C-alpha cells in the first residue's frame, strides 16, 4: 500500500489543511555568489517592457533615459509600461470624488508631520548605501559621514535638527561645483575631490544585491538599497501615502495581523450584503506581473501633483522631489563575476566596473548577451534605469493607485449593470464582481483588465483565478467563509532565539502562548511544544538537569550547585533546575514563577547587582539596587542576562579604526548622561553643542544647590572656576 499524503485532501478541504502544503521544516534557499547577473537581467527586462518609449539624454548626468509615458496602447497581453497620464489623473479625480476631502486632510496631516519630523528619523533602518564609500554602511554611520562631509563643505542647515533642513542641505549640495571627502587605505587619511557630475551620479545611485532565504521561489532575484540623499523625500512621500491609505476601506495597508483580518472580513461581508439577491457574484484571486518594473516614477509625480493641489508651494516641492530623484536613478551592478582556469587551476575576481570595456570571450552565451544589451546604459560604474520602481519602495502609493482602479468599479462610473470592488495591498488584490449573468461577469472582468492596462497595471493571467464568492486568497491569508489558521507559517519562530538564557526562555514560552491564542495550537500540542523547547534549550545552553550524567564542560559546576542547594524547584533551568511550566502559567516569567522556592543565598547570588555579567551605573558610585543592563523579552535581569561577543572581521580591514571612534563617542555620551539624567529615558532635542549645554546645566545646578543650601560656597566657587576654564578651553 503506497502512502500518498496528498490523498488526505479527498476528505479534508484544502484550506482546512493548508498548513500541510508549506514545507517550512527544511532550510530555505540561499544565493551563493554574485548578484550582477540578476541586476543586469532586471535592468534589461525593465527597459524591454518600455522599449517603444522615447529615448533622451539627461543633460545633468548624461545617462540615456527611456520614457514610456503616453506611449502606444498595447495590442496584446504582454506586460507593458505605457501608462496614460490622463487616465491616471482621471482615476485620482474620481477617487477624490468618491471620498470628498481625503486629499485635503491627508495633506494637512502630512504638513504637520513634515514640519515636526526630526533628522534622527533617518537613523532608523539596517543598512544604507553610503555615497562617500561606494558600499553599504549602518544607517547611523552613513548619516554621520554625510553630515560630516556636508559640514566640511559648508552645508550646516542640518544643525537645526529638522529633517527638512537636511533636505535643504541635500538640494544645496546638488549645486556645489565640487565636493571633498576623505578616504582610508593601508589607516591613513587622503582627500578626494568629486566634480559636479560625479557627485550627482553618486547621489542618485541605489545599491543592488541578491536576496537570501526566501520561501516558495525556485530562482533568485535582486533587491535594492537606497542612498542617503533620497531617504528623507521617500519618507515624506510615504507618510502622505499612509495618511491617504488610512482613509480607504479597500486598502490592505498599513494594517496587519488580527486587525487586518477583521478589516478584510468586514469589507468582504459588506460587499456581500450590498450585492443584490438576484445577481451573480464572483471573486478573483489575482496577482500583478512585474508590478514594480512597470510602475513609472513620472506617474507617481503626476499623482502627487494632483493630490497636493491648493497647497503651499514648499509642501508641493518637498513632496515632488522624490519622484524627480527616482526617475533619474542609477543602479549599481554588484560585486562582478569570478573566472576560473582549469588547466592552471586558479580563480580570480572581475569587478563590475570593468564590464564596460571587458572582452566578451570569458563569458558564456547568456552573460555575454546581458552585457551586450546593457552596455549602452553603463555610466561611471552604474547602469541608467529611468523606468520602474526598483524593489519594495512606494508600496503605499502603489496601494493608492490600485485602490483608485478598484474605486472605478462603482455603478456611477461603469454606467452598466455590472460593477466591482475588492481589496488591494501594494500589488496583490482580490476582486469581487457582481453582474446579472455570466456575460456581465465576463464584461466586468474585461473592463477591469483593460482599465488596469491603461494605468500600466498588468494582471497575471497564469497566477490569477476566479470562482464564486465565498473563498479566496489574499496576501497569503486563505479565506474559506472566514480566514483559516495556518500554523506552518509561524513554525520557524519556534526554537531558541539566541539572545541569552533568560530572553530565550521568555521568547519560547511566549511564542507557545501566542500561537495557542492565534494559530489554533491545541493544549496537548502546546505541552509537547513546551517539552521540545525545553529540550532544545538545555542542549543549546549546556544546562541539563543537575541530577543527570550528561558530559559537558558546564556539568561540573551545575552538579556542585545542585548538590549544595536545598530547594531544587527554585533553581532555574539555566542552573540545572526542573521545568515548572504548564498551560496555566505560560504568561509568567520564570524567575517570578519560582521566586517563592529559591534559597536565600542562591536568590541573592542570582539577583546581585554587582555581577560583572551586567554593566553598572555610576550615580553616586554604583546603583546597587537591581541588576540593570534594551530589555526585550527579559522582564527581570539576572546573571543569565549576559551579552555574547561581537564579530571581529573589521579588525582585518582599513575601517578598524572606526571602532576607536565609536568607543570614543560612547565615552562622550556617557558624560552627557551625568548632566541630563533623562537623556537615556527620552531622546534630548537641542541645537547647542554638547559642551555648551553641559556647562550651562552645571552652572544652573550649582546656583540652585547653593541657593537651596545643598552645597557650600567653596564648592560653588570651584564649580564656577572650572566652568570658566572649560570656556577658555572651548576657544583653544
Amino acid at each position: 500500500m503506497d502512502v500518498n499524503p496528498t490523498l488526505l485532501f479527498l476528505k479534508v478541504p484544502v484550506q482546512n489543511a493548508i498548513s500541510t502544503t508549506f514545507p517550512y521544516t527544511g532550510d530555505p534557499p540561499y544565493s551563493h555568489g554574485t548578484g550582477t547577473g540578476y541586476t543586469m537581467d532586471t535592468v534589461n527586462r525593465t527597459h524591454k517592457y518600455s522599449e517603444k518609449g522615447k529615448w533622451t539624454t539627461n543633460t545633468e548626468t548624461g545617462a540615456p533615459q527611456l520614457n514610456p509615458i503616453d506611449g502606444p496602447l498595447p495590442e496584446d497581453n504582454e506586460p507593458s509600461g505605457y501608462a496614460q497620464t490622463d487616465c491616471v489623473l482621471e482615476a485620482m479625480a474620481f477617487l477624490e470624488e468618491s471620498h470628498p476631502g481625503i486629499f485635503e486632510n491627508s495633506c494637512l496631516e502630512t504638513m504637520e508631520i513634515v514640519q515636526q519630523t526630526r533628522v534622527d528619523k533617518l537613523t532608523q533602518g539596517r543598512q544604507t548605501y553610503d555615497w562617500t564609500l561606494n558600499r553599504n554602511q549602518p544607517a547611523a554611520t552613513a548619516l554621520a559621514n554625510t553630515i560630516e562631509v556636508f559640514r566640511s563643505n559648508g552645508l550646516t542647515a542640518n544643525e537645526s535638527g529638522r529633517l527638512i533642513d537636511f533636505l535643504k542641505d541635500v538640494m544645496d549640495s546638488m549645486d556645489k561645483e565640487e565636493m571633498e571627502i576623505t578616504t582610508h587605505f593601508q589607516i591613513g587619511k587622503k582627500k578626494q575631490r568629486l566634480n559636479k557630475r560625479s557627485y550627482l551620479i553618486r547621489a542618485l545611485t541605489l545599491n543592488t544585491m541578491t536576496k537570501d532565504a526566501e520561501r516558495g521561489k525556485l530562482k533568485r532575484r535582486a533587491i535594492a538599497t537606497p542612498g542617503m540623499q533620497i531617504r528623507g523625500f521617500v519618507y515624506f512621500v510615504e507618510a502622505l501615502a499612509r495618511s491617504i491609505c488610512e482613509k480607504l476601506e479597500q486598502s490592505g495597508l498599513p494594517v496587519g495581523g488580527n486587525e487586518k483580518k477583521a478589516k478584510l472580513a468586514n469589507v468582504v461581508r459588506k460587499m456581500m450584503t450590498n450585492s443584490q439577491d438576484t445577481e451573480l457574484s464572483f471573486t478573483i484571486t489575482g496577482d500583478n506581473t512585474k508590478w514594480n518594473e512597470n510602475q513609472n516614477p513620472r506617474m507617481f509625480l503626476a499623482m502627487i501633483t494632483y493630490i497636493t493641489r491648493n497647497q503651499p508651494e514648499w509642501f508641493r516641492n518637498v513632496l515632488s522631489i522624490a519622484p524627480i530623484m527616482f526617475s533619474n536613478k542609477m543602479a549599481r551592478l554588484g560585486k562582478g563575476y569570478m573566472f576560473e582556469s582549469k588547466s592552471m587551476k586558479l580563480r580570480t575576481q572581475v569587478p563590475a566596473e570593468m564590464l564596460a570595456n571587458i572582452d566578451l570571450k570569458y563569458f558564456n552565451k547568456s552573460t555575454r548577451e546581458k552585457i551586450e544589451k546593457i552596455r549602452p546604459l553603463l555610466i561611471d560604474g552604474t547602469a541608467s534605469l529611468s523606468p520602474g520602481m526598483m524593489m519594495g519602495m512606494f508600496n503605499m502609493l502603489s496601494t493608492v493607485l490600485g485602490v483608485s482602479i478598484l474605486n472605478l468599479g462603482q455603478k456611477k462610473y461603469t454606467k452598466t449593470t455590472y460593477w466591482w470592488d475588492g481589496l488591494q495591498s501594494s500589488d496583490d488584490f482580490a476582486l469581487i464582481v457582481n453582474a446579472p449573468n455570466h456575460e456581465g461577469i465576463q464584461a466586468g472582468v474585461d473592463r477591469f483588465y483593460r482599465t488596469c492596462k491603461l494605468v500600466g497595471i498588468n494582471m497575471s493571467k497564469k497566477k490569477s483565478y476566479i470562482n464564486r464568492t465565498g473563498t479566496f486568497e489574499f496576501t497569503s491569508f486563505f479565506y474559506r467563509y472566514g480566514f483559516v489558521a495556518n500554523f506552518s507559517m509561524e513554525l520557524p519562530s519556534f526554537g531558541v532565539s539566541g539572545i541569552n538564557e533568560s530572553a530565550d526562555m521568555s521568547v519560547g514560552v511566549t511564542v507557545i502562548k501566542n500561537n495557542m491564542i492565534n494559530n489554533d495550537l491545541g493544549p496537548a500540542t502546546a505541552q509537547m511544544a513546551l517539552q521540545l523547547f525545553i529540550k532544545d534549550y538545555r542542549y543549546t545552553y549546556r544546562c541539563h538537569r543537575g541530577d543527570t550524567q550528561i558530559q559537558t564542560r558546564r556539568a561540573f559546576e551545575l552538579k556542585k550547585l545542585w548538590e549544595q542547594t536545598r530547594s531544587k524547584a527554585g533553581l532555574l533551568v539555566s542552573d540545572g533546575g526542573p521545568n515548572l511550566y504548564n498551560i496555566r502559567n505560560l504568561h509568567i516569567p520564570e524567575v517570578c514563577l519560582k521566586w517563592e522556592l529559591m534559597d536565600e543565598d542562591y536568590q541573592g547570588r542570582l539577583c546581585n547587582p554587582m555581577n560583572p555579567f551586567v554593566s553598572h551605573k555610576e550615580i553616586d558610585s554604583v546603583n546597587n539596587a537591581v541588576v540593570m543592563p534594551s530589555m526585550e523579552y527579559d522582564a527581570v535581569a539576572t546573571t543569565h542576562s549576559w551579552i555574547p561577543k561581537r564579530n571581529r572581521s573589521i579588525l582585518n580591514t582599513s575601517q578598524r579604526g572606526i571602532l576607536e571612534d565609536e568607543q570614543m563617542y560612547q565615552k562622550c555620551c556617557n558624560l552627557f548622561e551625568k548632566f541630563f539624567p533623562s537623556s537615556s529615558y527620552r531622546r534630548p532635542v537641542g541645537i547647542s553643542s554638547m559642551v555648551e549645554a553641559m556647562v550651562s546645566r552645571a552652572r544652573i545646578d550649582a546656583r540652585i544647590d547653593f541657593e537651596s543650601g545643598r552645597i557650600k560656597k567653596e564648592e560653588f566657587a570651584e564649580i564656577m572656576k572650572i566652568c570658566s576654564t572649560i570656556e577658555e578651553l572651548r576657544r583653544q
Binding site: 537613523t123 549602518p138 544643525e159 482613509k247 494594517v255 488580527n258 486587525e259 483580518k261 477583521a262 478589516k263 469589507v267 456581500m272 439577491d277 451573480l280 474559506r480 539566541g498 495557542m516 491564542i517 502546546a526 545552553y541 564542560r553 561540573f556 559546576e557 556542585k560 550547585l561 505560560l586 504568561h587 509568567i588 517570578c592 514563577l593 521566586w595 542562591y602 541573592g604 547570588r605 539577583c607 546581585n608 554587582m610 555581577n611 555579567f613 546603583n623 537591581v626 540593570m628 555574547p644 561577543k645 561581537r646 564579530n647 573589521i650 572606526i658 568607543q663 570614543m664 558624560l671 551625568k674 548632566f675 533623562s678 527620552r682 541645537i687 553643542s689 559642551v691 564648592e715 572649560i726
Partner: protein
C-alpha cells in the same frame, strides 16, 4: 564636582574636544547609534555556533578581580583577551554558574516592589478558581482588548507626562498637568515615592509598567478585561471553554459593564417568550458574571440602565428611571418617545443612520460639576437651563444637550476628517462620535447653532456662542441660572410594579420602563458571563446563537424530522428557536413566519419533494405567530452586530451555506455539522419550497418566452407555466398550483 572635572579632562584632549564642540544635542542621538556594524543576520545559528566556543560571553574587567581564573578542577572560567571595539574581556558560562553558587549574597527584598506587576500576575493565578470544562461550538471574534490595564482615567501621553513629572521634575519641558486626574495621580505617586532610593530610570520603567495602558487586536471569546486576557490561552479554545475566575480584586466599572450587557441580552431574549416575566426571572437566576451570581450584583450594584432596572423590578427591588449619556445622568420626568432609524447626511459629506426618538419629553441632567433641565421634541431642543460651576462646566453641559437634541444644525456642524467606522471597519455609535468630535472644539457648533434675544426673566444670565455672559441675546433656547440643583432627589429609588410583559409602572400607575426602551446594541462583556441551562448559548451573541440553533436542529434531526412530518404545531413552539426569533426584525417576524409555514404546507401536499436543507434553513423562521399575506420573499434578514444579513431561500448564502461534496453545513464560517442522507429525499430536481404558491419544475425553458421578476408573478393563473428569474442569476421554469 566629578562631572565637571571629567568634562574638563575630556575637553583637554583633542579628539574628545572636537566631538563635544562640533556635535549638537540633536546629533548626539545619531552618534549614539554610531557603530562599525552589528554583522548578525541569523541570531539562532550564531548562538549555536558560539556556544561551542571556549569563551563566548563578555564581562567587565572587574570579573578578573572577583572570580578565580580556574575552578576546583582547573577548568578556565575567563581569559584576558578583550572584546573588539570595547575593553570588556571574554568569559565562559562556567563563570556564570560559578557565581550563582559561590558569589557574594545580597538582599533582594525590594525586587517584588520593582516588578510588582509580574508578582501580581502570580498572585492572581495562585488564588484563582477553576470550574468545569465545557465542549461547545466556540465563535471567537476579533476585537480590541487591553493587555496592560494601566490606570483607569489616563492615556499614553498623560501617563508619560506624569512619569516625567514624578521622576524628572526639571526635564518636563513646557508641559503643565492640567487634568484633575493627572494632578491627583502625580500627587499620590509623589507621596508614595517620597524618599525613594531606587534609580530614577528604573522608577520610570516601573511607573510605565503600572500606569501606561496597552491595547491590541485579538480573537477573543468571553471577557475582554485585562485579567481575563492574560489567561486567554487557558480559558478559551477552538472547541472547549474552561471556567476560571481570577483570584484578585475585580473593578466595579467592569462589573457594571458586564451587568448591563447581561441584562440587555436577557431582556431581549425574554421579550420573544410567551411568558416574558418568568423567563426573565429564571434567566437572571441562572446567570453568573465573573463567578458571582447575578442576583447578588443586582442587589448590591447601583447601576442606572433600562435593562438593569427591568431586572431589578422583576426581582422586586427599587429602581431609578435614569440612564447615562455623555457623562450626565438623564431622568425623564415627563413625555414619551418611540425609536426610529433615520438616515442623515453629515456636515462633512457622510451618510449615516441615527436612532431618533420622537415625541415631546422633559429631562433633568445631573453631572459631577454641572446640572441642567432640558425640554425637547423630535429633533428639536425646546429649551435648556444650565447651572454649572464655571464656564467650562456650562460649556460641556451645553454641548451634551445640543448633541442629545439630535438637531440638524448639530449634524451639519460636523467638520474635518471625522469617521464613523473603526480602524477595522466596525461600526461606531454615531452619538458617541459626535460627542467626542464636539468636545474637542465646538466653535463651529456654537456659531451655527443660532442666537435669539432673551426676555431677562428672574435674573438668569445669558450665554453667547463665544461663551460669555450676555444679557440681551443668547444661544437659541439656552439659559444660565444659579439656583437649579435638585440633585438629592436624583438618588431616590422608587417602588415600582412590573407587568407580565415587562412593563414597569409607578405606584400611581404610570409606565416608566418597557422592553422597547432597551438599547438594541449588541456589545461584549468585560467579565466572563456564565449561563447554566440546557442551552448554554441562550444569551450569547448573534453568531453563536445562529450556529448553535442550526447545530441543534442538525443534531436532533431524527425526532425533529418526525415531528415536522407529523405534528408541526408543537415543533414551531420549541424553546430553542426563541433566541433565533430574537434576531429576526420584529416588524418582519410574523410575515416571515407566515411565508415559511405556507412553504412547509406545500412541501407536505406535493410528494417526492423533500429537501432536508430547505427545511433546516427555514425552520427557525416559523417560530413566530404567523401573519397571512401574499408577499414573495427571496431572502430573510437577521440582525447581526447591527447589520442586516440575508439568508437566501434558494441556494447558498453568506450566512447559511451547504456543501454537497462534503455534505456539510457552514453558518457564518462555522461548521454546524454534516447532514445525514435520507432515502425519502427527492432526487428529481424538483423544488416545492421556494415560492409561496408556485412549484419549480426545471431549468430554463425558452418555450414560454423571456423570464420575469419574482414580484411580477401575481398575474399568472392556475396551471400556467412560466420562466422566472428566481435565484442568483438563474432562470427556471415553474408552474402555479
Amino acid at each position: 564636582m566629578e562631572r565637571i572635572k571629567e568634562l574638563r579632562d575630556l575637553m583637554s584632549q583633542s579628539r574628545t574636544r572636537e566631538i563635544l564642540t562640533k556635535t549638537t544635542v540633536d546629533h548626539m542621538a545619531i552618534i549614539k547609534k554610531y557603530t562599525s556594524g552589528r554583522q548578525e543576520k541569523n541570531p539562532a545559528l550564531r548562538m549555536k555556533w558560539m556556544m561551542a566556543m571556549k569563551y563566548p560571553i563578555t564581562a567587565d574587567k572587574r570579573i578578573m578581580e572577583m572570580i578565580p581564573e580556574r575552578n576546583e578542577q582547573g577548568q578556565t572560567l575567563w581569559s584576558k583577551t578583550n572584546d573588539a571595539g570595547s575593553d570588556r574581556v571574554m568569559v565562559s558560562p562556567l563563570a556564570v554558574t560559578w557565581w550563582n553558587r559561590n558569589g557574594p549574597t545580597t538582599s533582594t527584598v525590594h525586587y517584588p516592589k520593582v516588578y510588582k506587576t509580574y508578582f501580581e500576575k502570580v498572585e492572581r493565578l495562585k488564588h484563582g478558581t477553576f470550574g468545569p470544562v465545557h465542549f461547545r461550538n466556540q465563535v471567537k471574534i476579533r476585537r480590541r482588548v487591553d493587555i496592560n490595564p494601566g490606570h483607569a482615567d489616563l492615556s499614553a501621553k498623560e501617563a508619560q507626562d506624569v512619569i516625567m513629572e514624578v521622576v524628572f521634575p526639571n526635564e518636563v519641558g513646557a508641559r503643565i498637568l492640567t487634568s484633575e486626574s493627572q494632578l491627583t495621580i502625580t500627587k499620590e505617586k509623589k507621596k508614595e515615592l517620597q524618599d525613594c532610593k531606587i534609580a530614577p530610570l528604573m522608577v520610570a520603567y516601573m511607573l510605565e509598567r503600572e500606569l501606561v495602558r496597552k491595547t491590541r487586536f485579538l480573537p477573543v471569546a468571553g471577557g475582554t478585561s485585562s485579567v481575563y486576557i492574560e489567561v486567554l490561552h487557558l480559558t478559551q479554545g477552538t472547541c472547549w471553554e474552561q471556567m476560571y475566575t481570577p483570584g484578585g480584586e475585580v473593578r466595579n466599572d467592569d462589573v457594571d459593564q458586564s451587568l448591563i450587557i447581561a441584562a440587555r441580552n436577557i431582556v431581549r431574549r425574554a421579550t420573544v417568550s410567551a411568558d416574558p416575566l418568568a423567563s426573565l426571572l429564571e434567566m437572571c437566576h441562572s446567570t453568573q458574571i465573573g463567578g458571582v451570581r447575578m442576583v447578588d450584583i443586582l442587589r448590591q450594584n447601583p447601576t442606572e440602565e433600562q435593562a438593569v432596572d427591568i431586572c431589578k423590578a422583576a426581582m422586586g427591588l427599587r429602581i431609578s428611571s435614569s440612564f447615562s449619556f455623555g457623562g450626565f445622568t438623564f431622568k425623564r420626568t415627563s413625555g414619551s418617545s418611540v425609536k426610529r432609524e433615520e438616515e442623515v447626511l453629515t456636515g462633512n459629506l457622510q451618510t449615516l443612520k441615527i436612532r431618533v426618538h420622537e415625541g415631546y419629553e422633559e429631562f433633568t441632567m445631573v453631572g459631577r460639576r454641572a446640572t441642567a433641565i432640558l425640554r425637547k421634541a423630535t429633533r428639536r431642543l425646546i429649551q435648556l437651563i444650565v447651572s454649572g460651576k464655571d464656564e467650562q462646566s456650562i460649556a460641556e453641559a451645553i454641548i451634551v444637550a445640543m448633541v442629545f437634541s439630535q438637531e440638524d444644525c448639530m449634524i451639519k456642524a460636523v467638520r474635518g476628517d471625522l469617521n464613523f467606522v473603526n480602524r477595522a471597519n466596525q461600526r461606531l455609535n454615531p452619538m458617541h462620535q459626535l460627542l467626542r468630535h464636539f468636545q474637542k472644539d465646538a466653535k463651529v457648533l456654537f456659531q451655527n447653532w443660532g442666537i435669539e434675544p432673551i426676555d431677562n426673566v428672574m435674573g438668569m444670565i445669558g450665554i453667547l456662542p463665544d461663551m460669555t455672559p450676555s444679557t440681551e441675546m443668547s444661544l437659541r433656547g439656552v439659559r444660565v441660572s444659579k439656583m437649579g440643583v435638585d440633585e438629592y432627589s436624583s438618588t431616590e429609588r422608587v417602588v415600582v410594579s412590573i407587568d407580565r410583559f415587562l412593563r414597569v409602572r409607578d405606584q400611581r400607575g404610570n409606565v416608566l420602563l418597557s422592553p422597547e426602551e432597551v438599547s438594541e446594541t449588541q456589545g461584549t462583556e468585560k467579565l466572563t458571563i456564565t449561563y447554566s441551562s440546557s442551552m448554554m448559548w441562550e444569551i450569547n451573541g448573534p453568531e453563536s446563537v445562529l450556529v448553535n440553533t442550526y447545530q441543534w436542529i442538525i443534531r436532533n434531526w431524527e425526532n425533529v424530522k418526525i415531528q415536522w412530518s407529523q405534528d408541526p404545531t408543537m415543533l414551531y413552539n420549541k424553546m430553542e428557536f426563541e433566541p433565533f426569533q430574537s434576531l429576526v426584525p420584529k416588524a418582519a417576524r410574523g410575515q416571515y413566519s407566515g411565508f415559511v409555514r405556507v412553504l412547509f404546507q406545500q412541501m407536505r401536499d406535493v410528494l417526492g419533494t423533500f429537501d432536508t436543507v430547505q427545511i433546516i434553513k427555514l425552520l427557525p423562521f416559523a417560530a413566530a405567530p404567523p401573519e397571512q399575506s401574499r408577499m414573495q420573499f427571496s431572502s430573510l434578514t437577521v440582525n447581526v452586530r447591527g447589520s442586516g444579513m440575508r439568508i437566501v431561500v434558494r441556494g447558498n448564502s453568506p450566512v447559511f451555506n451547504y456543501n454537497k461534496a462534503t455534505k456539510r453545513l457552514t453558518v457564518l464560517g462555522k461548521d454546524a455539522g454534516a447532514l445525514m442522507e435520507d432515502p425519502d429525499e427527492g432526487t428529481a430536481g424538483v423544488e416545492s419550497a421556494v415560492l409561496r404558491g408556485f412549484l419549480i419544475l426545471g431549468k430554463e425553458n425558452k418555450r414560454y418566452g423571456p423570464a420575469l421578476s419574482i414580484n411580477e408573478l401575481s398575474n399568472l393563473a392556475k396551471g400556467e407555466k412560466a420562466n422566472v428569474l428566481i435565484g442568483q442569476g438563474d432562470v427556471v421554469l415553474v408552474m402555479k398550483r
